[PDB]
Each structure stands twice: as structure tokens, then as C-alpha cells.
């Protein structure tokens, strides 16, 4: 079946360049346009440019100001996008999508890749610091703040996954080159602190796991 | 370029009831060959955009009959006869009639429910973070509806915006509420020069903000 395969993520420093790939399969690669679409975290979709793999003809969005370069490798059925002089405003998800042919425009956007997350940061791989959130009613809200790591993802569970109701794990946000996330859990006051509550944080990129028991504050 | 305006930035829908969204273009989308290249896409949370309708009214393979696209010229509409849970997400219109190709801003479909005030919890910096030279104050705003909310941070009575990191969850699977995390990060230096720290929750469920506070001298 028609598929477009994209790497999950690319990490790049400010001022450097990044190169992303889209490996096509299931159809005649050289007959259909390939388009690249950018999406900033909370925003909509934007066309960056497209390339016709038959010839290598390219179209670019003016707003990049000749920083994007699109290419194809017909021998591997792979389309490439390169972006130069990255700043934080290029941090986004970049989607491979398949256009039409030179004769019919109907198939435009009929197939998409899973997208490549591009995070621009000066940081190298950095493990998280995990901070407990204990209260300075029938319900009590506890939390654990996960700061200063790079890159994504970290996963958070409570009591090794046994505590899953009333849990809010908020999406990570990149700021000053490092990610920050938090997670809250609400449990009955009867059960804490008489029964322990521990947040489990895993950061595969740095081969790190942290357990933080939430103990009442003083 | 061709401006595509999506009406209803957010549409609160009810399962089993209809829904209708519109896309208006600043130019006629009728191409010289008689066709109109207007597509509708749905991006479910965490997913790539997926095409539902091409050629203003044509359904893609597998798209249920409940979806109907219509319109002509500059005015187009997507309709769902009875909304199902799998229809929630952000809907984008797209035009390929005029170069460059353009996307609409998007219309989000979310579940309508009764208003609910946020549950607000504030947390001072943990002692572990203070030994590292940082100081983050965390404010959770949990299980409110509708989704629009604003958080104000005050330090000894003065508003602070500088250093605030916000994060929001997707609509809850089970109770249809929204949750928000706000984190004010200072240096330990700055943090120990002030006494009073406050997050203020402004929400449509009340006319007075919800105020959670603590004094460093405690």
C-alpha cells in the first residue's frame, strides 16, 4: 500500500542545518509530487514547498527566504528536505505528503507521513531533574515537576502505573534549550500521606529512571 | 495568496447530533478546467492530518456517509449528520486551484458539557530545586470547562509574565474537562528577594478570579 516513512525526530543546534527524509513506497515514485508541510506546536498547517521526483523541479514558500532546499533520490524512492540557519521559530513537526501527478490534481494530500519533530536547541542529551510537588478538604492534589532535560520524550507514571485515575500529565514545553513538564495526581486525603505516592520518570535518551516519593512538606 | 477563512474556531458538538463548519476563500476556487480543488482534512489528536473530502464533495475511501461537503465559488461547508467520537479533532480546508496552495486556520470540534470551575493548587519551589540554584513555582488548574482560561502571576502584588511556562491537556476522555499547568521559574537569587507569590485563575464560571497564594516567610 502507499506509505511515506519519516524519522521520528531530529535534534539540531541554532545556526546549523537539518536534513529530513521521506521514504516513499507502494506506487511509482517519480509520478507524484511530494509536498512538505510545517506545523508549529499549537498552530495550523503551512505549505513549505514541494518537489516533482520525476525531474527534481521544486517550488518553495517565500517565507523561508531561500533557506529550504528540497531534493529527491530516485534510486531509494526518498525525498529530502534541508533547512539552513535554524532558529527556534523552525521548531515544529514537518509532514511528508503526496501530491498529484502532472496530469491530475485530484490525489493531492491523499497520503501523509507520520511527521518528523524538529527541536532546535543548543543542548546535548541532558537527564531530567525531578522535583516533588507537596501541599505547602476531601481530595489532595500532588505533583512532580520534571525540568532541564533534552531531548523528548520522558514518560511519567504514578505508583509504577497502578495509580492512573485522576492523573494529568501535561505536554512538554521547550524553553531556553531545555524541556519542562509536570504531572498532577489527585487522591483522597484519607489515602495520603498514610499510603505512599511516588512519581516514576523515565528518560530513554539518557538511560535514566527516577523515582520521587511525595512526602508532606515542612 | 488565497486566504482561506474557517468559521467557528471551535465548535462544541454533542454525540449523535449534527455539526456544520464552513470555509470561505478570498478568491473563487473554480479552476479553468471546470473543477474546484477544495479538500477537507481531519487531524485527530496525536495524528497526521487525514483527507476526508476532495473535489468539494467527494468522499475518500472509507469515510462514513455521515460526512457531506458542499459549496461553490468562494463559500464551502462540511457537515456531519450525527457526530461520533472519532470525528473530534481539528478540521482544515485546503485549496490547490491557485498557486501557492493554502490551508485554512482550522476548526476544532470538541465535546459540549456543563461549565466547571478550575480546581487550583499552588506549590512553592521544592528544597531539592533550591539547592541547585533554581526556583520554580507551580500552579495547577484542573478539570474546568470550557477550555478558555487565563493565569496571572503576582509577586508581592506586581504582575509577572517574565519566565512563565504554560501547558494544557487535551479534552479529557471521561469527563470532557480541560486542565492547565502554569510554571513560574526564577533564579534562587530573585526568588529569595520577594515574599508573596500568587497565581490567579480567570474563568467564565466566576466573576472573581480564583486566587491561590503563599508567602515565602512560612
Amino acid at each position: 500500500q502507499v506509505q511515506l516513512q519519516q524519522p521520528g525526530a531530529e535534534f539540531v543546534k541554532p545556526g546549523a542545518s537539518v536534513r529530513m527524509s521521506c521514504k516513499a513506497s507502494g506506487y511509482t515514485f517519480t509520478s507524484y509530487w511530494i509536498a512538505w508541510v510545517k506545523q508549529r506546536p499549537g498552530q495550523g498547517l503551512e505549505w513549505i514547498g514541494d518537489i516533482y521526483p520525476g525531474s527534481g523541479y521544486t517550488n518553495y514558500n517565500g517565507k523561508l527566504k531561500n533557506r529550504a532546499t528540497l531534493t529527491v533520490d530516485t534510486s531509494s524512492n526518498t525525498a529530502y528536505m534541508q533547512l539552513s540557519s535554524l532558529t527556534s521559530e523552525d521548531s515544529a513537526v514537518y509532514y511528508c505528503t503526496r501530491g498529484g501527478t502532472t496530469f491530475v490534481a485530484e490525489p493531492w494530500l491523499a497520503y501523509w507521513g507520520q511527521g518528523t519533530l524538529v527541536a532546535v536547541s543548543a543542548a546535548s542529551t541532558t537527564p531530567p531533574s525531578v522535583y516533588p510537588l507537596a501541599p505547602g478538604n476531601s481530595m489532595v492534589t500532588l505533583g512532580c515537576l520534571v525540568k532541564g532535560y533534552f531531548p523528548e520524550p520522558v514518560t511519567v507514571t504514578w505508583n509504577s502505573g497502578s495509580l492512573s485515575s485522576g492523573v494529568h500529565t501535561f505536554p512538554a514545553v521547550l524553553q531556553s534549550d531545555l524541556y519542562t513538564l509536570s504531572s498532577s495526581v489527585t487522591v483522597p486525603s484519607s489515602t495520603w500521606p498514610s499510603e505512599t505516592v511516588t512519581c516514576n520518570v523515565a528518560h530513554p535518551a539518557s538511560s535514566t529512571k527516577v523515582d520521587k516519593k511525595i512526602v508532606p512538606r515542612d | 495568496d488565497v486566504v482561506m477563512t474557517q468559521t467557528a474556531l471551535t465548535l462544541s458538538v454533542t454525540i449523535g447530533q449534527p455539526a456544520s463548519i464552513s470555509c470561505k476563500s478570498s478568491q473563487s476556487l473554480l479552476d479553468s478546467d471546470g473543477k474546484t480543488y477544495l479538500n477537507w482534512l481531519l487531524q485527530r489528536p496525536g495524528q497526521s492530518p487525514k483527507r476526508l473530502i476532495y473535489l468539494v464533495s467527494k468522499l475518500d475511501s472509507g469515510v462514513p456517509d455521515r460526512f457531506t461537503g458542499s459549496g461553490s465559488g468562494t463559500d464551502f461547508t462540511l457537515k456531519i449528520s450525527r457526530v461520533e467520537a472519532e470525528d473530534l479533532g481539528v478540521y482544515y480546508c485546503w485549496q490547490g486551484t491557485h498557486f501557492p496552495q493554502t490551508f485554512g486556520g482550522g476548526t476544532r470540534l470538541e465535546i459540549k458539557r456543563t461549565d466547571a470551575a478550575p480546581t487550583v493548587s499552588i506549590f512553592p519551589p521544592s528544597s531539592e530545586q533550591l539547592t541547585s540554584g533554581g526556583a520554580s513555582v507551580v500552579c495547577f488548574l484542573n478539570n474546568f470547562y470550557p477550555k478558555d482560561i487565563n493565569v496571572k502571576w503576582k509577586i508581592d502584588g506586581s504582575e509577572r509574565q517574565n519566565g512563565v511556562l504554560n501547558s494544557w491537556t487535551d479534552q479529557d476522555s471521561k469527563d470532557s474537562t480541560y486542565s492547565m499547568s502554569s510554571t513560574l521559574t526564577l533564579t534562587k537569587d530573585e526568588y529569595e528577594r520577594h515574599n508573596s507569590y500568587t497565581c490567579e485563575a480567570t474563568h467564565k464560571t466566576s466573576t472573581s478570579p480564583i486566587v491561590k497564594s503563599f508567602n515565602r516567610n512560612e
Binding site: 498529484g100 502532472t102 490534481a105 493531492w108 | 478546467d33 480543488y37 498557486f99 501557492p100
Partner: peptide, 5 residues
């Protein structure tokens, strides 16, 4: 239409 010659 985009992509057509």
C-alpha cells in the same frame, strides 16, 4: 491547479 503543466 497546482502541479499541473
Amino acid at each position: 491547479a497546482v502541479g499541473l503543466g
